[PDB]
Design a protein around this ligand. Sequence first.
Ligand SMILES: N#Cc1c(-c2cc(NC(=O)c3cc(F)cc(C(F)(F)F)c3)c3c(c2)C(=O)N[C@H]3c2cc(F)ccc2Cl)ccc2ncnn12
Lengths: 1005, 270
Amino acid sequence: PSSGELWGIHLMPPRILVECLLPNGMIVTLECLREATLITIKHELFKEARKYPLHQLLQDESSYIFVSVTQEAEREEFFDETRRLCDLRLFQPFLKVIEPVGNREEKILNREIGFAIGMPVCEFDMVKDPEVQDFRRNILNVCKEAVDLRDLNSPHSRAMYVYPPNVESSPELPKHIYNKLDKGQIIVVIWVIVSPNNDKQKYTLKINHDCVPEQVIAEAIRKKTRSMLLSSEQLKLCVLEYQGKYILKVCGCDEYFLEKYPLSQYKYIRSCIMLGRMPNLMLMAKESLYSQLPMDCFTMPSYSRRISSTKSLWVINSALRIKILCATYVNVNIRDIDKIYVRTGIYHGGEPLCDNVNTQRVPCSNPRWNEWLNYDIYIPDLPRAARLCLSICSVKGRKGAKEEHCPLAWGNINLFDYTDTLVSGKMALNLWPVPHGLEDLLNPIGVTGSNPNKETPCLELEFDWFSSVVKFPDMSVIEEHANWSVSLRENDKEQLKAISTRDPLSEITEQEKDFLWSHRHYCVTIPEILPKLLLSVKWNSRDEVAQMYCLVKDWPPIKPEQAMELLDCNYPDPMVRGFAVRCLEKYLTDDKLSQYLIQLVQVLKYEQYLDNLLVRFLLKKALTNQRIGHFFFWHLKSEMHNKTVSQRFGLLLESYCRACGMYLKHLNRQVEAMEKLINLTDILKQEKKDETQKVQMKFLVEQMRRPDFMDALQGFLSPLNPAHQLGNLRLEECRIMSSAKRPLWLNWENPDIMSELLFQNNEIIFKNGDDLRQDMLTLQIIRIMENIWQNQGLDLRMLPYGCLSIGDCVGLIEVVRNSHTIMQIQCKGGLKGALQFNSHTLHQWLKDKNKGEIYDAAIDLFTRSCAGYCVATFILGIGDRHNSNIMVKDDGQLFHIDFGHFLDHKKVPFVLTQDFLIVISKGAQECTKTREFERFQEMCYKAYLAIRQHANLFINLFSMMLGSGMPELQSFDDIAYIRKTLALDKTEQEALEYFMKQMNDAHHG
Amino acid sequence: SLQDAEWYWGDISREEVNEKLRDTADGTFLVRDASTKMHGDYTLTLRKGGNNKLIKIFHRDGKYGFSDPLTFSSVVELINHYRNESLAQYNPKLDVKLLYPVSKYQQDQVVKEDNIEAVGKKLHEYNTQFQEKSREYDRLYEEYTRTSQEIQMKRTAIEAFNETIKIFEEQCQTQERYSKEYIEKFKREGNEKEIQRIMHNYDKLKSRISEIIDSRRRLEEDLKKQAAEYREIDKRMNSIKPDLIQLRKTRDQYLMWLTQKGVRQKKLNE
Ligand SMILES: N#Cc1c(-c2cc(NC(=O)c3cc(F)cc(C(F)(F)F)c3)c3c(c2)C(=O)N[C@H]3c2cc(F)ccc2Cl)ccc2ncnn12
């Protein structure tokens, strides 16, 4: 959005000459400082203007403002005159003086939104499309609903928005967590700061794990008033005083206990029990917490308020036909390609409603057809979510070899628009590039819409016109048509239930799907069967669709892990997707919403229109819970570059930033912080790439010493976790790394009053050049698998470290402290065989770091985490990793890293190297025959079938990512590998023996 | 026999048959042993309506068929029956004959003396010719994406020049507006000194407007030339795609003569 303070210039010199244009036609060259604020500019300009002709015409300085052109090509009115000259992102150093017009505050706010979302808001105002303008206005009520809802019981409701409780989805902790409680109790330490020098004192408590925070405050004041000789009622008065006057905060980060969940349900304490660590809480004054919550308003924008006979589809008695006119800007070699043609198809999701039809073949030099393509479908039989998918294809011919067809550009069209009207008249859409690796002649999963890029192939069509506007029938007549068309058993019941078990991608033969459609009324007894039944509906028959609409209207709610499937690309019907959303907004916890946010943002792409039930649900939740609103913003912001969604996500971000409150100020600090980092890496990667790594080290330390840089990189919230404050930089520890892209190892101090009780310095890796969303999805999937195992009782410790993509191949990665690669650890040892590292070197290093009684714990943690990653990598095809791809903490926890690096190397067994068996067996001979290894592979077996028991969830999570643009996820065929490792088309014992044989072949026993 | 039938392929995956009925005509059919990997249980898939519709071939008492009433003796009898007349007998919802069979060892386009070098040599040749043309395609797509974002960087920069020029042209049109009748008033007072101050500043204005107008065309000139070579990179990729697919299938089927040995010795050597 801005590579520097001037076009083609990273930083302005300390002094530059600014061309100032006056309201009289006089041009004044003003020398001014790089950092000069516009208040200083305007004052010194009108001070200098007296030296130039026609001064009498100038009104008073205060009656004018500056306007200029930004590097985003925006004529920006600089209302906020406090900004530094060099922060304006000017295209050229000039300023035009004008009288201010319009709402000052709205203009200042739009500039701040534009910086946040990466594009000027004014670009939305120029959009002809009425769907865009209707969207901007019609979701402002979702913003009002959310703002009014969180300003209801101020300041508490406002605190619950900014600092929402970070709690598990269930208070019912499993027994392997409970068994670490001292006879059902937990020990906690409460801290308090005293003013004279911010000295601090602690109070240790033992309490029931399920005490609410106010009860914890009761036990604390009860323990301190021990000897005060208070009566039972005087004790109540001060308990009441403190319960209502103070709250509890986690020492070292911005997490609070503002709601009365049981203490053990807060994730910070659920893990202190799991990890057996000491929960440290700080008693804090509520009036001090509310002090750092400045009131924030939400004002309706200008566009929110003002603006300057049909027949039903089911009366049209004719089959569908569409005219392909001609094409433009087709890039094809006229002597290597024989002919070109337009391929088309009518799609409902991914299933063709009818057979495809193509225009006649045509010479490359004259892309013109003027053909009416006739489709085998009755117009009344069109479903609402019907889409036209087309492409321009080329052919190369040969007799000794088959004729080859290839797509050149694709485009998809909604046959009904967002107002329920069937399209008519001639239309012209610019087509999209065929994504790398796709060879199918059409792309039905791609977005619907014309490519805004210029000089791109433009195809022109014409749709029939039926003498008047045609609209999809209202739901009123749809149900009556079902009453028109519609005019127990045992052995069938076991088969129906036998079909609910099968995964979303299992083969469903014709006899099975029409068998579901036959017993479609009995299916409500097993609501799990709905996705199978919907794929059984013949969507090109208005008789069946209407009958199916009545069933989904009364379908018993399914739980979110199942409803999410109905948001993927195979369920585009708006009634099905509306049912799925209603399942989420009444059964999906903010915990599991935040867990699946990645997939939920991606299915927005499959949505046929801008305004839909899903986006209003996500937007609603993002504005009432600032934790998920933080990542809601970054996941949208990270894909702004992609022109296939830049508008959809851009309009969605505008509404969020316009109603997220004071958190926009914080986000802009994050955005500006990343903008500075990405500009320094680009300079290191584009200019001084040839320089030495020590020359580059200079540019860095020097460019990091700049005051403007440090002020922008010191004192902001971590995008990986806004609860972590990033204070001053420890430049001593900052460095470029050895990778060719040279990522930045960054380290901040933790400014928390009691930072010493969590982590005193926080360090993150910033990488520019690698696509990180493969690591995000893999790490997310690892976190899902760990959550599944823990709740089943398997204490397999995974390490889904923080990873966030913030843009096109740029993002952040959480550093794991006190950890090394297995390769690094082998190098700490010696050579045993002939030029061969010692296999026991790993076991020995782990003993040195865990002397004494803590040795057994480290071996247990290594065997449990090793079992977890062995199963995880096998299932997901991560498999053969290098010793530099695998890491281990001094604690003994093992974890893999850099998964995109691995998938990228390709574009299987699992690792069970001897060095790991030495540790697992505690340094024994024939380690494959001890009883430690006996129970190690027993953990792996239980972990494998545990993930198989939740295979539907993972297949649905991957299916929701097909429209993401990740080359690993371009078709359901890609997802079929997880059906192979999980052996879903076999029985349990067959999958278990498949996993056992796999593990046995790993150690070749 | 069934094992030798044209349209029986055996242990073939669903994703592999989807890759064989792609954009084919209604009636193209093919049978596998069911993905369940259970003996004597099969699945037939035929193209109809642009879809690959699967049906299960039940088996009981040695008979065959794909409905509860079971009749036929062998699958070859079950299939050929529906090759002569339509399968609308089973379900009127689809009424195509099993028209086009796709066989396993047709399209075996290796014609010369089947010396083992037809694998050890010509396979390594095509596979080397396949990975080279793949290297070039990835090289093109890289500089294609680079050129793509460099172009839109320049389109927005000329659009910025358009706004700056729009703002300097309106400046000239306001200089002439508010200076005319002061030039006209100075003219009759005999104050050429003040007129040249105004003109010296007007010249300064339209002197700079010439520089930014030149900087624009110098950019529109770079844009015009980079937009052209961007279209050339596109047509080159479109010429490499069909060839790349042609010799990738040739490299794949030249494993037929590796399957002649079955055990992958003659590629394990490579
Ligand atoms: N590589 C590799 C590889 C494979 C291999 C690996 C993979 N895995 C991923 O793609 C992958 C896994 C993640 F967890 C996250 C991501 C991310 F982030 F992109 F979203 C992507 C798949 C296939 C084959 C295949 O057919 N479908 C792929 C697949 C498998 C699954 F279980 C789940 C999903 C998918 Cl999509 C097999 C053998 C072998 N021998 C040497 N390498 N290697």
